[PDB]
Symmetry: C2
Subunit: 137 residues, 2 copies
């Protein structure tokens, strides 16, 4: 069974629904559940992986509140609240490794997928865990 | 709760791994489990789905590919519902099967290829469907 699920969100209307769905999976697997806000801007200023409860301005007060609000939208405990920017292949690979994630859950948004498809060859990343891609609902 | 899972196998030596993962899920949901193999080809040359189960029953099995699909399905420790084959665009062929057989979970596998290549192929399939899709890594 899964031990730690990570839901990638862009903090849109889609996110709360995606999180509710992941909570359902977490409850069946008795798994830890974490969330990572993904910045899809192509700016390369202060990029990287951030733990929002253990912090920059790359993350804004606006997005900061929205992510904390999303986590409080379900009763299920949220273990890590992260934010990633820059090369998303590298950022997600790092979050999965660092936090021992075994299920990555994502939505359907096009800009998010375009960013994931732009990960570079600088490091030949791959995904070594299951990934559940969730349709629009 | 899922009622019908479809696993798309690439017929590589790691296919059993993908099948075992899919069975584990089918048991948990008490769901039907079907199998499909898509011969990746140009979209313009797609002629429709092939019911390999029906072919078998009418002695129409002609390709080693179809035979391998039947052989693989028979080895699975779970009752298999549909056994399908198609040649064309991955999302095109899978979307068709999903629609025709009321599938609610699609399971696909990859061999841990370069991140962006994987995500690009995944998105292509994702944009042709309206159901959950589990993308599974296959190693060694």
């Amino acid at each position: 069974m899964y031990k730690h699920i990570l839901v990638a969100v862009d903090l849109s209307e889609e996110s709360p629904i995606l999180l509710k769905k992941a909570v359902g999976i977490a409850k069946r697997h008795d798994a830890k559940l974490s969330i990572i806000h993904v910045d899809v801007n192509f700016s390369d200023l202060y990029t990287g992986l951030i733990d929002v409860n253990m912090s920059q301005d790359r993350i804004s007060t606006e997005t900061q509140k929205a992510l904390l609000d999303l986590a409080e939208s379900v009763d299920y405990p949220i273990s890590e609240k992260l934010s990633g920017s820059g090369d998303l292949g590298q950022v997600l690979s790092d979050a999965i490794e660092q936090y021992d994630v075994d299920l990555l859950v994502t939505g359907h948004h096009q800009d998010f997928w375009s960013k994931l498809m732009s990960s570079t060859r600088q490091v030949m990343n791959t995904i070594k865990i299951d990934m559940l891609v969730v349709p629009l609902r």
